[PDB]
């Protein structure tokens, strides 16, 4: 236990700042780090305390940041009583005695502009809200029961009201040998309460009994699943919503509704010889009929249901929305097909997948607040396609396209190509696109109104990392938005690694915020150095992946 090497950086938000670590072993499995952070523009010292523990309940990390005073928060907020800043973070995860599960994910800030001002270690400036979760569960092989508490704090100053589950109880029971049928049951009891006092609160009790018959062969499979959904709502604090909306929520809502689903998966093979001998191509059709009756949910507030994104494996879901408030009607068939190419060692080299949903009736739920650019209701409306090609042991490419006929445009698309020799040598190109029609559909009205959200997503990203002489590592990343012809992110990093020490110099220019006065984006720079000690262990890495995680758009490996 002692002082580490103090280390400095220069940002445009804090000007020149430095860290002075001190490390402490309380007892082995418990350590702590107390770090003064002197920042010059804010003109004070933030005290950053980390405390990591390992116990029988699991492994956890606690973080406490305290800035006693702020000149800048006194400048752009003169009317507040104090300019103090604080962060509290708690991440706990563990399984005790193989049946008890404890998970804590807690993050509370003093002010909604915290992560735009300070360092991004356990949060990010990209984050729009902070999470506060507790969950305790008991899980054995045929039964699980989890109680949880989910509270969120929203950073955006348009509407800070967000609902919370205080508490939520989930019960699952399974029994897979009732004749030829497999049965399961899922129950949920959840109390929804909002931060504002004029917004209506609820208590949901849900039961879901389910039977299914699976049959399988060497070449195909079929699965028939029958399901009930019983839901009781008790809704209170209903006066303010009913005083200003045309439709009326009721205080006691019963919703009992079936679900019938037939799934069928079909497999063909072929020995393909025109590419190479021994290669095998499998063609896999898949079909699905789903029928869900229509019940009117206009008398139910939307607390925890959001519209689900429909990829190729997301085509075959039995739920249009997540959660349990909005369950859309279904009279649909989903048809998809997947071609796979295996090599002579039965290792999968290529796959391509393309599918569609045909709707016989309109998927309606009682209220239709999502807008569409045309009135297409039935027919082939949603198309999806995925691809993955492993070109060699070093190359790989992924692709995904999602088209909606109701948007009259491709909804989302992504692609990536990656060359990778080892841990240290890599090039990756990636592309992301989301249409502004789908932004107008699945996101609320000020996103389609305000200029920083209404253009959709079209970014090209280039990541590279290269060593020199097995002691220098150079890392670069460039993410660029092609709609505005403006950059989103830049990152550079040069690290010299020796036998007992390592020096890392990092640079990042990032999108951080938006200026509401002059209507343009806000960029911040950061140049910094880190010195760490080697030789105490077998860590002879060049630090490439620790530099690849250091920006607001991280590296992930796509082979």
């Amino acid at each position: 236990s002692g002082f580490l090497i103090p280390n400095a950086k220069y940002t445009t938000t804090n000007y020149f700042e430095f860290y002075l670590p001190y490390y402490w072993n309380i007892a082995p499995n418990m350590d702590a780090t107390i770090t003064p952070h002197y920042m010059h523009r804010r003109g004070n010292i933030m005290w950053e305390n980390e405390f990591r523990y390992l116990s029988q309940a699991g492994a956890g990390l606690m973080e406490l940041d305290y800035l006693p005073s702020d000149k800048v928060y006194e400048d752009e907020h003169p009317n507040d009583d104090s300019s103090r800043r604080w962060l509290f973070y708690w991440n706990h995860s563990g399984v005790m005695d193989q049946v008890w599960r404890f998970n804590v994910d807690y993050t509370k800030v003093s002010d909604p502009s915290y992560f735009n001002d300070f360092d991004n270690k356990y949060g990010s400036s990209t984050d729009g809200y902070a999470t506060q979760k507790f969950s305790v569960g008991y899980a054995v092989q045929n039964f699980n029961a989890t109680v949880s508490t989910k509270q969120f704090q929203v950073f955006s100053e348009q509407n800070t009201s967000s609902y919370s589950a205080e508490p939520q109880l989930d019960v699952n029971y399974y029994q897979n040998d009732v004749g030829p049928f497999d049965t399961r049951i899922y129950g949920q009891a959840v109390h929804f309460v909002n931060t504002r006092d004029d917004m209506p609160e609820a208590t949901r009790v849900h039961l879901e009994p389910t039977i299914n018959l699976p049959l399988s062969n060497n070449w195909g499979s079929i699965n028939t699943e029958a399901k009930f959904l019983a839901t009781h709502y008790q809704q209170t604090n209903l006066d303010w919503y009913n005083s200003r909306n045309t439709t009326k929520l009721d205080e006691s809502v019963n919703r009992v509704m079936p679900q019938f689903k037939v799934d069928g998966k079909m497999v063909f093979e072929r020995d393909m010889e025109m590419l190479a001998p021994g290669y095998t191509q499998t063609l896999e059709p898949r079909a699905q009929y789903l029928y869900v009756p229509y019940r009117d949910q206009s008398d139910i507030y939307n607390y925890d249901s959001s519209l689900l994104q429909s990829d190729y494996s997301g085509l075959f879901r039995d739920r249009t929305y997540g959660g349990l408030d909005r369950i859309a009607s279904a009279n649909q068939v989903t048809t998809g097909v997947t071609s796979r190419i295996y090599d002579d060692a039965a290792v999968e080299r290529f796959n391509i997948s393309v599918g569609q949903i045909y709707y016989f009736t309109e998927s309606r739920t009682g209220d239709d607040n999502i807008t569409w650019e045309n009135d297409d209701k039935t027919g082939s409306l949603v198309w999806a396609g995925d691809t993955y090609w492993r070109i060699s042991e070093r190359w790989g490419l992924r692709g995904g396209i999602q088209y909606d006929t109701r948007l009259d445009n491709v909804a989302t698309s992504n692609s990536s190509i990656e060359y990778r020799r080892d841990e240290d040598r890599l090039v990756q190109l990636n592309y992301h696109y989301a249409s502004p029609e789908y932004i107008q559909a699945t996101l609320p009205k000020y996103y389609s109104t305000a200029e920083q959200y209404k253009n959709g997503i079209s970014q090209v990203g280039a990541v590279a990392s290269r060593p020199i002489a097995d002691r220098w590592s150079i890392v670069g990343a460039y993410y660029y938005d092609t709609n505005a012809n403006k950059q989103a992110d830049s990152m550079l990093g040069v690290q010299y690694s020796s036998c007992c020490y390592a020096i890392r110099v990092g640079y990042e220019r990032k999108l951080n915020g938006w200026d509401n006065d002059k209507q343009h984006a806000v960029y911040d720079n950061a140049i910094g150095f880190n010195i760490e000690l080697r030789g105490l262990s077998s860590n002879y890495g060049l630090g490439t992946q620790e530099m690849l995680r250091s920006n607001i758009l991280p590296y992930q490996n796509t082979l």
């Binding site: 019963n254 009992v256 509704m257 079936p258 029928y291 009756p293 229509y294 019940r295 009117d296 009607s329």
Partner: peptide
Amino acid sequence: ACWHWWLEEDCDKKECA
């Protein structure tokens, strides 16, 4: 009034209470 639990579809509220 006019509640459904089985596979019959719900209908619109301006003709039924």
